Symmetry: C2
Subunit: 363 residues, 2 copies
Amino acid sequence: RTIRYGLIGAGHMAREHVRNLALIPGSLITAVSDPQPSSLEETVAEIGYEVTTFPDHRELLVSGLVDALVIASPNDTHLDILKDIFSNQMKLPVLVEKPVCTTAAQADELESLAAGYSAPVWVAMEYRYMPPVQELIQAAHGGKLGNVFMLSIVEHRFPFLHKVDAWNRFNERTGGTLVEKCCHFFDLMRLILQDEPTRIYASGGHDVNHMDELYEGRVSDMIDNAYVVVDFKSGRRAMLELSMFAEGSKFQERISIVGDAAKIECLIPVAASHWIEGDESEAVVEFSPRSPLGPETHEVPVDEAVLAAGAHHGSTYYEHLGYRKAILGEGPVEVTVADGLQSVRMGLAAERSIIEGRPVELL
Amino acid sequence: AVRTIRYGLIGAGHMAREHVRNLALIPGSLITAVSDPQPSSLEETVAEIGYEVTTFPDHRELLVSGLVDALVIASPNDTHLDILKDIFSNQMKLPVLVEKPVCTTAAQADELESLAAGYSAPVWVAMEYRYMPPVQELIQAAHGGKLGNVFMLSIVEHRFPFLHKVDAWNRFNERTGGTLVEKCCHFFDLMRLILQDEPTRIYASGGHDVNHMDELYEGRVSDMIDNAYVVVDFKSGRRAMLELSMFAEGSKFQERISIVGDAAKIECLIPVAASHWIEGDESEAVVEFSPRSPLGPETHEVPVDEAVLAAGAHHGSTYYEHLGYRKAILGEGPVEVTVADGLQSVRMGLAAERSIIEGRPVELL
Ligand SMILES: NC(=O)c1ccc[n+]([C@@H]2O[C@H](COP(=O)([O-])OP(=O)(O)OC[C@H]3O[C@@H](n4cnc5c(N)ncnc54)[C@H](O)[C@@H]3O)[C@@H](O)[C@H]2O)c1
Ligand SMILES: NC(=O)c1ccc[n+]([C@@H]2O[C@H](COP(=O)([O-])OP(=O)(O)OC[C@H]3O[C@@H](n4cnc5c(N)ncnc54)[C@H](O)[C@@H]3O)[C@@H](O)[C@H]2O)c1
């Protein structure tokens, strides 16, 4: 059963989508849209076979060429493109890239519109499918840690990469760092702890990065490091640590979950495309029972092709298997617009916390 | 020539016995006097000393005994100020090593602050963690610029519930100052030390979620926190985060400290003390230096002298603390951990406890 995919936005992440679809039988890209032909040229080369291209998504939407959509355009364009999809005579499934939107007003508007749209809308927050992360989720959800109380997430990575039109350098286009980069983490918090946030507090700064990059004399206004503490309805708690100038760290992600029977932790290595050649490491998961003492540690292997197709530890592949099911009406949307909105509202509350030096309540 | 120092110990329990074992490694360290209102404690501690000393049920008799050149206080937290006041009113001007927390309440801190200013002999607050060999490496790297400008300091402690103590003194906030004072003053102090700056704002989320639920004390259950996340902002916009869990004793490494600067990151991992871990699964602490450019992390074990490590449960730190205190007693070095350091550490913990209760940040001066 073949699915005809249309890509709206044909840049870096789009090419990751391409390489992952290439690993899933019945995945045919038929249409790609991007206002920049140098992006289309690069992405079509990556596809490796002929597709129809369009400068504007609206022509793609009425092309008759597609069964399902993927949006990989800049964050602040997601709602506009979604609206055109929602108004289309053909109502198609959409995988829309993270952040689903970038402001509080966008979130409010998207919430009304998506509620009235009849086809699957999946927000492409894929980190839960990283095999190490899946192990932690199953351990937490399956009771192996006892009652869960704490979730720590540490991301230590390189500065935001250069992008088409330098779109990721200003809060006005990204929603802020804690939306652009940390929606994934706020979503993992809700997933792992199976609960809703009530309060968020963050300390953060723009302290290091992009100080030498000028746009009409102006520097990037985005955060490059933060600590965020999130309280939950049930009384569980989570903390996110982010540094966008800690690319020295062999393990880019550390996730720890502490319960009253055990702790579990994973370490996720820097993707091979950004690390030292040859010094390739697997992710590790450590299970640490309170009693009896005796931690268990294991490497978590990922299929070599799956890992090579993306920079997110094989997660994008699993994301597509799930989206495929949603497209064929054989499975649910696992990451919904509601999930995306919570993630964004959490990021937005964190950004406001940083500015105001007060915690921010969520309803 | 070993210079002999006559030490008086006030409080003769668990930590006192660690003090004893450490002094035993330092030539010229003679315990002459030990005070404790509980004879079972004196019996235990004298056996640990291994030679005869004069004992007193009350420190006030020890203070005027003429037997001592220097004091160590290892009594319960809420007694430290009272004992210090007796020392300050004595006309003997004896150096004191007073165990952390230096005090337990805001009113105690205000009072101690005025009184300590008028006392002319060394007062050292016994927050020893800086002398843990791996931690000293991180401090030197940070202070020496190997990380570039320092922005972030993460401290994670994953350990066992508070141990049972004499008179169960450590089960209520009223006696301990709260978990973030009793257990975390060490960490707030390391923050000030490493970042060389003062806190402006503290926010914490924490609870009493797991521990001591089956212990009753005149019908009451322990009111102390057993897990927390604390975020601390500093005048120079550096930031630190403390994560504590008192129910994560399965973790091989009880402490993790990471420091992130604009040139490099450094991290250390401190193993559970051998007296609390599995026999035979002994590991050393590890330090990893991670330069941003070029990529290439450097990892090494940080070995500790075997006798020093065996003498205490704080990775050799107590030994170095005593070498430092010895120097202060002899007028050959400064008090490295002052009453001001203790007060800041306590006030930070106190603010954190209040933050947890009130769900708001707390501003510090
Ligand atoms: N899920 C993940 O792990 C992950 C990783 C990286 C990026 N992303 C997301 O993917 C999206 C794209 O980021 P990127 O790194 O690929 O950026 P990029 O700059 O490489 O590519 C963006 C592309 O969008 C095109 N474009 C700009 N305006 C558009 C519009 N109005 N309609 C259609 N296309 C338009 C640009 O011409 C460019 O080709 C962002 O939302 C980003 O957050 C997700
Ligand atoms: N790493 C460290 O720096 C560290 C570690 C453990 C304990 N401590 C500190 O050491 C102190 C004692 O803790 P511990 O674990 O030894 O407890 P413990 O209960 O084992 O010993 C405390 C002793 O103090 C005695 N005592 C009670 N009231 C007294 C008073 N008014 N004057 C004199 N002695 C009195 C008790 O009888 C008991 O023998 C506390 O301040 C604690 O915070 C520090």
